[PDB]
Point group: D2
Chain length 97, copies 4
């Protein structure tokens, strides 16, 4: 009933893989993150500094999953890591938006 983190990754990989262009390179992917993080940063100041929030959040989560798959990293396993610690043209852009 509730998606396994590993599946959200799979889903996002199905999508990107359909363009037969692979994922954005790490540095490009970073720009993507800063980008969406800037749009999310706008809405948060909009609503708390004077279903948009949900979408501006998903947008970052998307990029974050992309970057994860792009480096063959399990977002789940990465989450466990962090938790453990606390307890102790060349542009194929036709591919995303």
């Amino acid at each position: 009933s509730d998606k396994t983190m590993k599946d959200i990754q799979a889903e996002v990989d199905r999508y990107i893989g359909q363009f037969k262009e692979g994922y954005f390179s790490p540095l490009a992917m970073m720009a993507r993150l800063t980008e969406e993080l800037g749009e999310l940063a706008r809405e948060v100041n909009h609503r708390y500094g004077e279903k948009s929030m949900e979408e501006e959040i998903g947008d970052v989560l998307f990029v974050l999953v992309c970057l994860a798959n792009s480096l063959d990293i399990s977002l789940e396993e990465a989450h466990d890591r962090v938790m453990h610690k606390f307890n102790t043209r060349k542009e194929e852009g036709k591919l995303e938006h």
Copy 2:
């Protein structure tokens, strides 16, 4: 038998934050918190696949911890606003390959 669900990850975080009297951060504080960990993630990739000098240290789990931190903070910002990441995910996967 079974792996971790996105809902459980959000819940896990909330049970963790819930044992602190302070609780969650405000949206604007949480935001600065997020761009902080992003910068570290950025610093790392610039070293591993970027143009800063290649580390001496052999391949580790640095990239995962640096990504796990952004994911953490993002989850924190999501719980604090009663937002379901699983559901937010379906959004993009809808407006995209509609």
Copy 3:
């Protein structure tokens, strides 16, 4: 001889701000505003020099938006951007 100094760019801005008379933004609100323009700049860079074209803007302007907000924060916190600079340039050159 008439090139705009740094000390007066902050000055020209402080003057523009003292019009609205509602003060500069709070450091955290200001920070949010900064990352907003930065990712806006990121959007262009990824378009003109990256691998992701933009939808729906001069490169020069996007940098200016960031320089503006950067200055605003610097001013609100009574900071000399010029001094800040030389401090930085000193770390790079001093102590070998």
Copy 4:
């Protein structure tokens, strides 16, 4: 001796000019900013040298401009003009 924006840019150009690598390509430069933005963000959270963490973001920002022949002065004027005109 009081510094003009161009001068500052030039001074920075001379530093980067000392080494072979030169300026980082735009996407690498973009990540430098994001890196120094995180650190500045940390201080502003922790408090609300601020002069140091702000100087860093200003340094990288200048580098990017130098590597793309952008005059920060002209940039600052276009952005100022926008605020004025309407």
